[PDB]
Amino acid sequence: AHPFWLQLLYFLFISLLGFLMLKALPMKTSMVPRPMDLDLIFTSVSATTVSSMVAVEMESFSNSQLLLITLLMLLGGEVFTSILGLYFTNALLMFVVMGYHAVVHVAGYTAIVVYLSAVGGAGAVVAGKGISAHTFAIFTVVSTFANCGFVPTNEGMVSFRSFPGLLLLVMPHVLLGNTLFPVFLRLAIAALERVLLIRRRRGGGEGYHHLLPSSRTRFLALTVAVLVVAQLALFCAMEWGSDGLRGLTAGQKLVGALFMAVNSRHSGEMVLDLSTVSSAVVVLYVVMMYLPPYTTFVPVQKLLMSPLSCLAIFIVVICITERRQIADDPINYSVLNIVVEVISAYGNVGFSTGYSCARQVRPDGSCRDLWVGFSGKWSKQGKLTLMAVMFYGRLKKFSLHGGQAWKIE
Template identity: 45%
Template sequence: MSSMKKLIHSCHYAGSQFCNWVRPRAARLLRLCRDSISWLSRFLLFHVHPFWIQLGYYLAVSLAGYLVLKATARDGSELRHRDLDLFFTSVSATTASSMSTVEMEELSRAQLLVMIVLMLLSGEVFTSLLELQLLRLKLLKQSRLDEQADRRSGFVDCIELGIPSSAQKVDSNQHNEAKAVSVRNPNMSNKLKYDAATCLSQVVLGYILVFHVLGSGLITLYVYLDRDAKQVLERKGLRGDLFSLFTMVSTFASCGFVPLNEGMVAFRKSPGLLLILIPQVLAGNTLYAPCLHAALWALEKASAKRKELGDALRNGRDVGYFHLVGSVRCRYICLTALLFVTVQLVLFCGLEWRSGIMSGLTPYQKLVCSLFQVVNSRYAGESAFDLSMVSPAVLVLFLVMM
């Protein structure tokens, strides 16, 4: 019994000694990792051109996507041995080029989830959010440097003027007035830009979440209620929620992938689904700037106490976020997009209304499918018709609009 106690005591002593030996070394390792990450972030922000950052981002995401796609392939699937095809698909999803050398129905559910992540990371709105985060870090660093420079210059001025140290402290009212007057001072601009960038990043994140959650919910609800759409998914063995999320992310990111080999041709007789997707195409692409401007304007009116919303709305381009434009330019963007879509819709319907690609559709279905087609020809690349049956004149029209 005494030998057992000695053994337990020796084990406890050895364990405590080991913990005492590991704890400081682990702390030093964590501190080294933190300092290395901080140094790397400063190096990337201030010494590396944004082009190389973006190139490294897309290469890293594409390579990681390829490895995960290969690891999540079905057992016995030929995709495990088609490395080039998987890498091509990963790059295509990451760059939103909507090209693939594999049939989408060959992908497993896990691979479809990987594709969702890749398309989400490649969307123009999401990448602009990442740019905002990098911009915030840079502005935060610059604003801190400005504050340090202001403190040093103020201290030097006090010494040169012979002001005693007790007089260096001003009351809060005078300090606030000085800050208000110095808004036009370049040393204060970085702080204002940082606040505007922080507000913008929150609004853009909310923009992404609202469209994806609302869009996926509407698609799921429509698929549940519409018999034709439900039958298509049941025939393909595809879950409605997975289809909704995949299609929503792909459409918003203008990627053009659909988890069906036929694409959206299988839903030609489901005009409600096409009408749900059309605003998502526009909101994630050309009309993103007007929609963001409208969202900021509405939030500013709804919450008057948050002055940073107004600052972000008026100073967004000064911050460096070029997706945020003025109200006049937003109107021009909306009018231009409406004009192009209208002209293309009229020409497409005039040339293809009685053609074979429209056979079996009601006039309402023809109109909705045509609208979906012309909108996607300029943006996402999804198709409600078999383009191999489209007349050469329409193909030339699509080419010009693209």
Template identity: 35%
Template structure:
């Protein structure tokens, strides 16, 4: 009887094991089919998206003018940004801004005009992130990079073809003498065509390297700017306490401030702009470097970067970019003499405003409570930002009328 029970138990266990194995195999097959189906669906969707992006790129690059591309770019992003601002809820639940206000804020951030109709502290972190993204894609350096990426090569080909075009002439041909017929086995290109092909390759290589340089330039200043601001805020309790009292995320503030300064957007997460940090000269100096690198001295820094790469790599492309700036058709890349004149003009105007600011308002209410070094840095911050960025470290209503007039002239 016990042997019968053992046999039945083994038989039952074997059947259970077999059924379990079959069930696991069916489940595995279904899972494999599901994964393959989803993978194929995602792959097909990815392929469709790539084709769509490629179609839009080719259509915009070949059929639309530069003006139409810029207009479509800014108008579409302004409306998309306003929709995102409306859908995202502000941090102040009692605050319900209208769509016109959000459209104005979106357009102001995208065009880096620095104007606002609502207090930035009443916006949520998500809305502030949208404004930061809009300032980034609307900054001058990023827009010039897009121009490089959308550079059309067909215009160069047409220009070169028209340059070597020969007008048709009528020639009467006589019957050839068979004894004078010469058979040519091979034809070698003329020296002119070889030189033209090499020049075209060199110009294309310069454009490609210029894209890499500008992209690295943008990434470097944003990465180091955000990191240095983060380190400073975490190490200085005064700046950290201001953000904690206002309920502003430290990383988001550092990133947004860096983007705003580099793009010369003028929108800061605090209602007082940078006046809340007028006793933090190190932070103001970091932002001054961002403002100069993103607009006023971008041609100088770009030329210095190319010159440094030429000295290190000894490549012909960098020498050609410095020598023949007009062939790249990249407006920020100016000849050496024009770059020097532009840089001297920027430094001269900033120095003039700094001297006038300190001489007129040194003992005034505008610098009340600041020591000498903080006054100089605050005045320098205003001198740099008055040209384009629109950020301020003091109360503008306390500035003397003569200095205000000079600021208006500089703007």
């Protein structure tokens, strides 16, 4: 069995199960009609293929569907699908990877809740939202760590903006579950060595696709900081006296800047909104957000097309069939925003510029803009194509090749 097919079926079945059990469960309170089936399946797909693509307000979700999405996105986190693959490849490192999965989860949702309760601060916010502190902590942890980014509140982290606690206490899980997974894996195996030599020193790699040679661990930790600090520097050199950053203090704004820079890689947790930000920053986000997480700067089948060519074709489709809204509301439906959304689907971040109705070239009729955050392109065909891009991007490691026959000079 080709692991591509196996994981495709895994994700498809888990998404279907999540969608069904999300449809069944009660909705928060009773005054919100259940969203159309497409929105629900979109939320299930986003949760499974750890990303975000909110597409449905998170304050319109019960405390039961919150746990459902918790266990729908955990089953779909990178480390888990890695453990589930090791199990089949084992029929001993699986034990340690699962142990650290559990350890980091426990630390996360036993520290976030402690911060929430002990020091009130931004504790009344979640209480007003109707989300329990325990459920909020669980959802955030199983999201952020799985590098999903789904936040319990409609605001996202902008509600927790102006409070650095849940930003520096959450991001470490972004840096502990998706990109710097091998680095901390090796670093903790170094401590475990007190008691497992064959896993450390160079060899066959134990057939573990998420383990790298020691050289590449340190060299991938370099690419990260150099990209994280690059995004942080650009965002602090462009959007520092911006309109969406005025009421924050210097430290309480740099916290959000670092959160955005770190999460932009493959987590997708937003504290700002990607509409009042210069296009030279969202372009850098797109560029640093298309890159696969184990992409390293090492200074030391023919019918398939390259991932960038596939993204080009998908953007071509999104623009080809969602006309009459690009030509009607160009500011909101700018090809920059379309590209950002498509490459968020592909990169499994879930960055979204939203659909602030104030940006319409001309306000027509009743525009009671929802707080979904750019629920795709508000067309069924576009939502389906975006979900296809999402599924193609989750299993990107099995198609990253491409090209070949497209032979350049």
